[PDB]
Amino acid sequence: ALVKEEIQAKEYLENLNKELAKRTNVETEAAWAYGSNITDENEKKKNEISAELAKFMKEVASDTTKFQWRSYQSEDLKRQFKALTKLGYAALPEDDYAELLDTLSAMESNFAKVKVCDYKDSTKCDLALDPEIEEVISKSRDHEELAYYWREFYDKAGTAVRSQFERYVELNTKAAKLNNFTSGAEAWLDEYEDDTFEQQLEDIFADIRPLYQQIHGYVRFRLRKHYGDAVVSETGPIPMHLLGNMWAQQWSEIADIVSPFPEKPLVDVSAEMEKQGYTPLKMFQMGDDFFTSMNLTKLPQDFWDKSIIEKPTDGRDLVCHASAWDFYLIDDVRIKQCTRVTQDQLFTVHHELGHIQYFLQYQHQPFVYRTGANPGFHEAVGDVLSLSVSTPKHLEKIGLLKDYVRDDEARINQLFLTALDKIVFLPFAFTMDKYRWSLFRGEVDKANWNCAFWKLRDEYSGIEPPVVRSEKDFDAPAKYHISADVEYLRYLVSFIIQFQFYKSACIKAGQYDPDNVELPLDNCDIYGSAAAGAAFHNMLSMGASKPWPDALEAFNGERIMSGKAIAEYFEPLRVWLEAENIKNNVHIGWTTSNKCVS
Ligand SMILES: *[C@@H]1O[C@H](CO)[C@@H](O[C@@H]2O[C@H](CO)[C@@H](O[C@@H]3O[C@H](CO[C@H]4O[C@H](CO)[C@@H](O)[C@H](O)[C@@H]4O)[C@@H](O)[C@H](O[C@H]4O[C@H](CO[C@@H]5O[C@H](CO)[C@@H](O)[C@H](O)[C@@H]5O)[C@@H](O)[C@H](O)[C@@H]4O)[C@@H]3O)[C@H](O)[C@H]2NC(C)=O)[C@H](O)[C@H]1NC(C)=O
Ligand SMILES: *[C@@H]1O[C@H](CO)[C@@H](O)[C@H](O)[C@H]1NC(C)=O
Ligand SMILES: *[C@@H]1O[C@H](CO)[C@@H](O)[C@H](O)[C@H]1NC(C)=O
Ligand SMILES: [Zn+2]
């Protein structure tokens, strides 16, 4: 019975893979329509399609129980069946499932329709996060203006959806239990296929905390000289609204005021991008070039015909948060980005294009294997290229960085600017899932949900709100991914493993030798390296066909997620920075925040 049944099973899967691909295509199309044009109508359609696919997924789960799949010889077949048993939200009773979609939709659409009044003109009330409020948080050095925009934004994107958030936690939890995980924490963590994963990340975070604390301390020092001691204390958490970003996840936008050597060059090519007439189209074409230059795959025509790479001008509602989309056919991949001509946006274009490349690289695989080896792998791909693009080396080659001397002081400036984006983010990213895990697991009482957020943010990042908050506010959904039910640990894993890929890609490209001051890891450009491209191909082409350790091994021979590489990259900075903090008697650490009242 069992040798025969295994042969039938292979044909069952082959055939079922194709059907899921096609049914997902339709669901994706409806999601796309909504996300690119928010209306009551498109909401209904997206939600009804999803409901129907959920119903089919349930029959598929049920059909898995008819096959003796755990007894089969083929690891590969067992892997595909295992994946089909994991329903996620689709396990919910029909009505509960529809209620959950309506709750998610309410939250995501609240986020995307937020608008605030101009600080200087309360008649003018149509400022959106993207682009208006983002530009003020990133450019203004008026602490009171900054604080105003912070409060207006968090009040509308966060507090306004407490009731919905709460319902979502209930449903998320119910759904996980139906799949027999303890909570949604364990449902998310199952993607990493490793029991010790949480512990591994705590270990890695603990090894990098000291460097993070040195950075924190230095930035605080510099902010005090800018804003004065009335605005920033020596010993407390940094007021977050001064850190150049609405969530303080990255601080690179205040590099003008905290850079180690302000006499020396600090790389910001936005102004040159605008002077040379760059458009979004050019930016995407440069990204394409980067990948084709490494002998990877060209964007297909469908990409250019159907992508949305600039913010519509018909004043409609849409989700402007940048995203990459697989449509599960052949060569139908798309990006929706409300692209602006800046350095940071050029990196985002590479980031998103990294997802697109992953899609194209694994599109021959069976449907259940057409995703990342783990979610962090997907988010890392494009960032490995962004690491290169951001190098002075690369930016001189493309004519965006003019008259740059690469002295020791400019290296330090560049290193620190990178650290503001890459080290700073790690605690931030860890907290976004720690908060949510703690609610999913039932560890925090509803009475304390807002202060448990800011508590994590204090303990891990050493920041706090500009104003006093309380349990009358609900601040966590003011972050896109929280409002939209996007797991965030992927981004923590990405910011660690991308240094492992980059370092390895740099070695393959000839651009990095430890024992050679002409090839330092932080000036490595892998543009043009078919040797780097080959490693990418070997790993990305695998999809989720094997456990992620085997995908990493395809790239570089390793099997372990490790913080060695990111430390190696920042080692030069750490040595200078420790010494500079001691030279200036810089206070390190912070007192417990007093900005969330229970
Ligand atoms: C999450 O964990 C849940 C437990 O916390 C789990 O729920 C259980 O799922 C079981 C599915 O295996 C289910 O098992 C069956 O139960 C039938 C009787 O149960 C009733 O009585 C209970 C009290 O006694 C009530 O509380 C329930 O509500 C039920 O109404 C059994 O009659 C049934 O049996 C048939 O199935 C087996 C088939 O199993 C195998 O397959 C082949 C052949 O098909 C065999 O050769 C093989 O060795 C093995 O037999 C047959 O052996 C048998 O002859 C019958 O045809 C079966 O045992 C159980 O009821 C349910 N329990 C509870 C408490 O809910 C969820 O499944 C988990 N969810 C996920 C997503 O994994
Ligand atoms: C947005 O979608 C609506 C349907 O709710 C449609 O009629 C409208 O014209 C759309 N706008 C664009 C530009 O797609
Ligand atoms: C480029 O990729 C192809 C597969 O598309 C491979 O066969 C070949 O070896 C690579 N070429 C170069 C320039 O190494
Ligand atoms: Zn991404």
Author numbering: 17 to 614
Article, verbatim:
The dipeptides with a C-terminal tryptophan (IW, VW, YW, RW) show an identical conformation of binding within the non-prime subsite, with the tryptophan residue occupying the S2 subsite. IW-1 isoleucine and VW-1 valine sit within the S1 subsite, forming a hydrophobic contact with Trp341. IW-2 isoleucine occupies the S1′ subsite, forming hydrophobic contacts with Ala338 and Thr364. Due to the similarity of isoleucine and valine, the interactions within the S1′ subsite for VW-2 and IW-2 are conserved. Based on this, it is likely that the difference in the dipeptide affinities towards AnCE (IW: 0.08 mM, VW: 0.17 mM) is influenced by the difference in hydrophobicity, with a more hydrophobic side chain being favoured. The tryptophan binding within the S2′ subsite is conserved between IW-2, VW-2, YW-2, and RW-2, where the tryptophan side chain forms hydrophobic interactions with Phe441 and Tyr507, a π-stacking interaction with Phe511, and a H-bond with Gln266. Out of all the dipeptides, IW has the highest affinity for AnCE, with a Ki value of 80 µM (0.08 mM); this is most likely due to the AnCE subsites being relatively hydrophobic, with any polar interactions stabilising the dipeptide backbone. The difference in affinity between IW and VW in AnCE is likely due to the extra carbon atom in isoleucine, which has an effect on the van der Waals interactions within both subsites, potentially further stabilising the dipeptide compared to VW. The S1′ and S2′ subsite changes between AnCE and cACE could result in higher affinity binding of the IW-2 and VW-2 dipeptides within these subsites due to the changes from AnCE-Thr364 and Gln266 to cACE-Val380 and Thr282, respectively, resulting in more hydrophobic pockets.
